[PDB]
Amino acid sequence: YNTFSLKLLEDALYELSASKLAMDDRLFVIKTGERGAIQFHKEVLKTVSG
Amino acid sequence: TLQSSHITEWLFTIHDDVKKRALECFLETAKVALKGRNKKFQYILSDTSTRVMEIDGDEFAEADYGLVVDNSNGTQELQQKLDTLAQAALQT
Amino acid sequence: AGKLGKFQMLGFQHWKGLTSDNHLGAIFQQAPQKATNLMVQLLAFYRGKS
Amino acid sequence: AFGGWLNTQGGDFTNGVTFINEGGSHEENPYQGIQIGVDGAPNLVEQGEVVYDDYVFSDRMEIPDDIRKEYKLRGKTFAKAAKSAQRESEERPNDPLSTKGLQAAMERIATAQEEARQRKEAHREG
Amino acid sequence: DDPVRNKILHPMGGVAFSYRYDIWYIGTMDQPNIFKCKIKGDNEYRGYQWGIRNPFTGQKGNPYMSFDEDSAVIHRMATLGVCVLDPTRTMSLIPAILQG
Amino acid sequence: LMGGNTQGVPAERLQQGERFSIEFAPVEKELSRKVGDVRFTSPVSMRNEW
Amino acid sequence: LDTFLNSFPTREFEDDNEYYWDVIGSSRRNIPLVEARDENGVVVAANAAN
Amino acid sequence: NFPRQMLPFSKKTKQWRKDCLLWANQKTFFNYSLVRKSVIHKKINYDLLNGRLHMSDLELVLIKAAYIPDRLQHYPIMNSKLNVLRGEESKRVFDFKVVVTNPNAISEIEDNKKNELLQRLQEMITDTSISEDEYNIKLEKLNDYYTYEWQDIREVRANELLNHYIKEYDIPLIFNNGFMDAMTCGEEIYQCDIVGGEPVIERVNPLKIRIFKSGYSNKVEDADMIILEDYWSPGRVIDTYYDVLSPKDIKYIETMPDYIGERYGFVNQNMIGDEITVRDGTYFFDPANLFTEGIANSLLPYDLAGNLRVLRLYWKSKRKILKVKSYDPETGEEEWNFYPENYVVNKEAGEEVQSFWVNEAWEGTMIGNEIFVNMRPRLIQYNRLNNPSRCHFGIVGSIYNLNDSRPFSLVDMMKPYNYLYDAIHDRLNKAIAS
Amino acid sequence: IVGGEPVIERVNPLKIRIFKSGYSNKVEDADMIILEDYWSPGRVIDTYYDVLSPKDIKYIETMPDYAVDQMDNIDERYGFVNQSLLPYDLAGNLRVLRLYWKSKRKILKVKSYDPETGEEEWNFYPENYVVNKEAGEEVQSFWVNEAWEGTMIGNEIFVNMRPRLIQYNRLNNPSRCHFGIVGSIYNLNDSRPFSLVDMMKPYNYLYDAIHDRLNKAIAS
Amino acid sequence: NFPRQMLPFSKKTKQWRKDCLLWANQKTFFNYSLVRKSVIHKKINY
Amino acid sequence: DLLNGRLHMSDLELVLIKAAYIPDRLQHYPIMNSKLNVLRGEESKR
Amino acid sequence: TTIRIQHKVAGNKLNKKLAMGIPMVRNLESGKQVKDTANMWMHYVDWEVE
Ligand SMILES: [Mg+2]
């Protein structure tokens, strides 16, 4: 990617785990760097401002 | 097959030696474990044996006090000599 | 790679592989020993108290 | 409990010294001491004293300079000098030379404490 | 976040490898997904190639000389690997400036 | 070039300022010969006056 | 990087030069159609009757 | 560089004891001992008795696949030779008891220590008995001991220690496994130690013990420095070191990745060449210049399976002591005593002193590479009466050699015949096939 | 101990997984030991009648008597056999997995002075012991092995996950414990064992090939 | 992963004890002992 | 060395090697051991 | 993957004490340099080979 989008990431962590994983078995811990979390924070901020 | 046991007795003779010193070493190792606040050694030792530790000589080896771990032929004759004397003392 | 104070005359140094005695002298870790019991007086018959 | 003991190799080995800690001072402890025994009957001790063969080395006194160069003591107190006489014998409780080295050194600090207690007693009554 | 190994910087501040998202564990598998492979129990080499003395092990005298120099050469060799049984249990998300 | 690369490295990735770091030293399995080396360092000092 | 690679378990391999693991799918499957034919052997087009 | 052991005890600090263990880990896997053989030579003799035939030990190799048209079937005809002699030893009688060597030799220092014992028993029966209710029956117990002598009370204790623990540990099986190790490599070694408060005894794997600094001595007790490497479980290190392992050191055990489970790892010293060949896991070398193959020679990896690695180093350092000549107060007898270096001499009473440097047995242990534990002077100093310097460790054993050589084992004199049996039984298995 | 009375069985050497042994030729020296067998439904209630819930008796009863994932996914690798993983057998037998493992218990080593005589005493207390200050009690906290156990029956039954009640305790170690499983390996010098069958198996394979050529010479 | 054993007695709850069994599930496939032969080698012997 | 199973080729013939291979060296067969080992086993039983 | 390393030193460095003009340091695995007080040279080589 170039531009991060969380609407794709929730649509891509779900389609491989839709009816194959349980409801308690969907905690998705993302491992990244210090700057990846701010790219994550500014895009959760754009969901909750929509 | 006695004279074929003569051929391999050179293995047992050094092996009976290592069984002597591995019990001479274990006896000194057990002697230090007495003076280590161990409530087991009051069960396997008597009244008078649990009092030897307080005399100021229990740190040294028992070879310096005149005691050896001896499995020889003399101590097996003596072990029988005290037994046939015991039954012959029982009768009469 | 520069200086942090004014009198940082030393620079960080580095090398690779086989180290000789010369690599141990250029990093200032070899010094001539002083035989302290060895002390000499130059032989003369001094006549200053004469 | 690391006070004058070598708790190693599954056993509890001591060198004779009883390091007495964690009770409190004679004023601060409610039971006026630790009360280690019933012998007098209230044998009272505090956070600093050490015992070797029922002899108490006091932690509230000090070391006179006369009784320091004599007897060659190292600690600033008699308890802190008997805490320095057993530093060799702490790691070696069953060494025969170290038990002889300890008991010979423990009678010196026992002698030097009776010399300093006599000098303090004689000066105050005078 | 390492700036020694990751050398491409990202235009939004900081290194570009730190903008990579990776979900290493997805669900329960009933086995290790990611584990370290190792042959016959860790097996490793500690060779030594020395002349009249060995500075490494501290040894003067050689009954069986390697060469005649005044030296000592150490050799160390090890074989090793990593395994991912199910790579569909892992999802990556990589910046494209790192070039594939 | 390792990794099975056949078409080569692009010439815009071999320019002045390209930084090279040490990954590892892979050897052949049969009849390998010695590779790799070992890297050292040394510090600096500072000063002040009255 | 070292404490990343310490959270992963270990497995002793009996030497050899390569390892295989067998992955499995599902036994249930839907099969596409090539064409249907009626009773007289001719095919069913799209613009046909029932 | 081993650190200087010619120091006062105050300069044997935390980092000095740690520097002795970092030396034994790093440098020594040397295996240069004058009277004992090499670890790959003993391991072949063990592998011949588990039925594994090394093709690099009966020819020059020119395979590694487990099939007969390029390997050689083994026919274990040396096992049944050795299983008679470990079978006879199990059926020999085992009555090892402590005896007085001269029971009719009772002296005055013996008779004083008996009277110290009977006084110290007499103080106990006054305190325990509640006003003559059992003071008469406790006195009847020790009226028997008025006839007992000091060399008998010392022996009754020394037999009661052995008679229990022989019967508990099945010590005749610890020894019977050792005699089997006596006939394959010629090394029989036993370690006696205080573990968990009690004395234990274990036989030491002769591939896992390094005996340094001995003088063509057949006795393992004569050595100065013994390093014992093994792979202990995490449960066995807490059974032994529950008492000395910091909570930080428990988190080293508790942060271990998982499990794995004789290829620990191989060292080769005096390598003539650089060309090493390995992809299955054993290292192949120059044909005649080198070993030509590597059978594990060391325990390099700090954790195999979940099992940790426990390196124990026992070493003789030097201790400064004092010999003091003091006169008896009552009569004019010069008496010699031995005091350590911190004892101050009582002058003005005639005490003449001289300082001697004397062996002291030390020990230290590292578990893995982060835990450093029990770095102290060894608390079982195997002491002798008139000798301050004569000690050893728990490790006791013997080499079965002739005249300070390396031991010509019973397997070693039957291995050339068993290699030829495999050579001729391969012509037979190809004559049957055609 | 089953049924209130002690028993002793033999462990099938194919049905035990001995973890974390230290090149020991013994079985009590293991830090973790897994016993996987298939039990009759009578034996899972002769053993666990007093701890099974009516939910879990239903699982023993209303198993199909010839398992599916949470999102209805059929586990397709249940239908393969080699030349476990199968909670109920096709003979009406339930998977019984028993995990024994040495945990870590924090304990205290407490130094007490005797009241009457001036002699120190040592005891061991668990970590919920509050120390008796103003009486000289010095305390140091150790970590110590504690044998735990647990049992799974099929896939849904989880029974007797608790510290093991037969702690094989020794008098001086608070940490020397093991499980009920005791055994020994008949090996030589920390190796894998060379059995009697293994040392005769190359000769039994040679007998079958030459009794083959004998039988094809008899036939022709 | 086998959960933490360096816990107090209070944090060894029901879900913790259930985690040790679900770790131990499907671990009977492999071999884990340095002094045992494999189950595919002893089943040939029986 | 004969009793330790070492053969020196410079004692049974003039040699005209240092590679220990039976196509140039000789294999020793230690048969003087069990002749001497009877007599040392009879010392231990007198 | 099969890897390999090698260091070569001169023979005179067996007992080569360091007269430390600047303090001799060891590289940590974390990237830091830590000041050391040891004076023999082969203590610092054998740190860096591992
Ligand atoms: Mg009793």
Short mmCIF file of C-alpha atoms in Angstrom, two decimals, chain H residues 68 71-73 75 420-432:
data_model
loop_
_atom_site.label_atom_id
_atom_site.label_comp_id
_atom_site.label_asym_id
_atom_site.label_seq_id
_atom_site.Cartn_x
_atom_site.Cartn_y
_atom_site.Cartn_z
CA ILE H 68 22.97 -51.88 2.91
CA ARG H 71 26.56 -49.30 4.33
CA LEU H 72 27.37 -52.29 6.54
CA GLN H 73 25.10 -54.29 8.83
CA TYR H 75 26.29 -58.03 14.28
CA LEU H 420 36.25 -58.26 10.77
CA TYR H 421 33.08 -60.17 11.65
CA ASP H 422 31.05 -57.45 9.91
CA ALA H 423 33.41 -57.64 6.94
CA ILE H 424 33.01 -61.40 6.50
CA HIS H 425 29.29 -61.42 7.31
CA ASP H 426 28.83 -59.00 4.40
CA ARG H 427 30.43 -61.46 2.01
CA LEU H 428 28.01 -64.02 3.43
CA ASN H 429 24.96 -61.78 3.01
CA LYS H 430 26.00 -61.21 -0.60
CA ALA H 431 26.75 -64.89 -1.20
CA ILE H 432 23.28 -65.82 0.05
#
